[PDB]
Design an enzyme around this catalytic site. Structure first.
Site, short mmCIF file in Angstrom:
data_model
loop_
_atom_site.label_atom_id
_atom_site.label_comp_id
_atom_site.label_asym_id
_atom_site.label_seq_id
_atom_site.Cartn_x
_atom_site.Cartn_y
_atom_site.Cartn_z
N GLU A 14 41.13 38.16 50.03
CA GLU A 14 39.84 37.92 49.46
C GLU A 14 38.72 38.26 50.35
O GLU A 14 37.65 38.52 49.86
CB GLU A 14 39.73 36.42 49.14
CG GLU A 14 40.75 35.91 48.13
CD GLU A 14 40.44 36.42 46.76
OE1 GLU A 14 39.28 37.00 46.67
OE2 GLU A 14 41.18 36.29 45.82
N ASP A 52 32.03 40.20 42.66
CA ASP A 52 33.40 40.51 42.79
C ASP A 52 33.69 41.80 42.06
O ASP A 52 32.80 42.43 41.51
CB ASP A 52 34.28 39.29 42.42
CG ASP A 52 34.52 38.95 40.98
OD1 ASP A 52 34.25 39.88 40.11
OD2 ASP A 52 35.04 37.91 40.67
N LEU A 69 34.84 31.93 43.03
CA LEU A 69 33.98 32.35 41.91
C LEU A 69 32.83 31.36 41.65
O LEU A 69 33.00 30.13 41.58
CB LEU A 69 34.79 32.60 40.67
CG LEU A 69 33.91 32.79 39.46
CD1 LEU A 69 33.10 34.06 39.65
CD2 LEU A 69 34.81 32.90 38.23
N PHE A 92 45.33 31.30 42.15
CA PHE A 92 44.04 31.24 42.79
C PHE A 92 43.10 32.37 42.28
O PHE A 92 41.90 32.20 42.14
CB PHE A 92 44.28 31.45 44.31
CG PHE A 92 43.00 31.44 45.14
CD1 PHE A 92 42.21 32.59 45.22
CD2 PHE A 92 42.59 30.31 45.84
CE1 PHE A 92 41.08 32.60 46.04
CE2 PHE A 92 41.43 30.29 46.62
CZ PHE A 92 40.66 31.44 46.70
N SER A 149 57.21 37.66 32.54
CA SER A 149 57.49 37.70 33.97
C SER A 149 57.96 36.33 34.44
O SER A 149 58.81 36.31 35.31
CB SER A 149 56.35 38.19 34.90
OG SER A 149 55.54 39.14 34.28
N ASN A 208 57.46 44.41 35.44
CA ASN A 208 56.67 43.80 34.38
C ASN A 208 55.29 43.30 34.86
O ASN A 208 54.26 43.28 34.17
CB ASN A 208 57.51 42.66 33.69
CG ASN A 208 56.79 41.92 32.58
OD1 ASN A 208 56.00 41.01 32.84
ND2 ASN A 208 56.99 42.35 31.34
#
Ligand SMILES: [Cl-]
Ligand SMILES: [Cl-]
Length: 162
Positions: free
Chosen positions: A11, A20, A32, A104, A117, A132
Site C-alpha cells: 500500500e 487511490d 480509504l 483489507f 475461489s 480463478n
C-alpha cells in the site's frame, strides 16, 4: 515477513491525502477515507478519523495508528463472516496473511463474494484457485499487487515479497 510488513509494501505510506487507483481519497497506509468526489468530504472524514483538525496531513504515528486499526478490523471481519471464517480456519499462517491482505484491500463483502475461489481454497486446490482469482477486476486493475497476493496463496511462501 508478517501481515503488517506485507501490507506496508503493497500500500505504501503517504502522509497527505491522495487518490487511490480507483480515484478515492486515501491517506497513510491504504486507509480509504471516502468515495466522495469532494476533497472537503475527505478532509472532514480524515479529521473525524484522527480526532484533530488535520488540514489533510497526518504524522507517521497517526498513519500507523490507522493501520493498526484497519488490520484488526480486517481480522475481526474475517472471523465474523460466515463465508470467510471457515476458509481462514482451514489455512496455514502464510495463506491466512494473504486472505487478510485481500480483505483489507477489497472489503469483507468483496472477498466473501469470490465464491468459487473460496471453495478451491478450502479444498486446498492451490493452482486452480490461483487461476480463478486472476479472472477478476481486482487483478486487472492492480495486476502487480494481485500477482503477489495470488502467488502467496498458491505457494504458501513469502517469495513474492522477498
Ligand atoms: Cl476510522
Ligand atoms: Cl499493481
Amino acid at each position: 515477513m508478517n501481515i503488517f510488513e506485507m501490507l506496508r509494501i503493497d500500500e505504501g505510506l503517504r502522509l497527505k491525502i491522495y487518490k487511490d487507483t480507483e480515484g478515492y481519497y486515501t491517506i497513510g497506509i491504504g486507509h480509504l477515507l471516502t468515495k466522495s468526489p469532494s476533497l472537503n468530504a475527505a478532509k472532514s472524514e480524515l479529521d473525524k478519523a484522527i480526532g484533530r483538525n488535520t488540514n489533510g496531513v497526518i504524522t507517521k504515528d497517526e498513519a500507523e495508528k490507522l493501520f493498526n486499526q484497519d488490520v484488526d478490523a480486517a481480522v475481526r471481519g474475517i472471523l465474523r463472516n460466515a463465508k470467510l471464517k471457515p476458509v481462514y480456519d482451514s489455512l496455514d499462517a502464510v495463506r491466512r496473511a494473504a486472505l487478510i491482505n485481500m480483505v483489507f484491500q477489497m472489503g469483507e463483502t468483496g472477498v466473501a463474494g469470490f465464491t468459487n475461489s473460496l471453495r478451491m481454497l478450502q479444498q486446498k486446490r492451490w493452482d486452480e484457485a490461483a487461476v480463478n482469482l486472476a479472472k477478476s477486476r481486482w487483478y486487472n486493475q492492480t495486476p502487480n499487487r494481485a500477482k503477489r497476493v495470488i502467488t502467496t496463496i498458491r505457494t504458501g511462501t513469502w517469495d513474492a515479497y522477498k
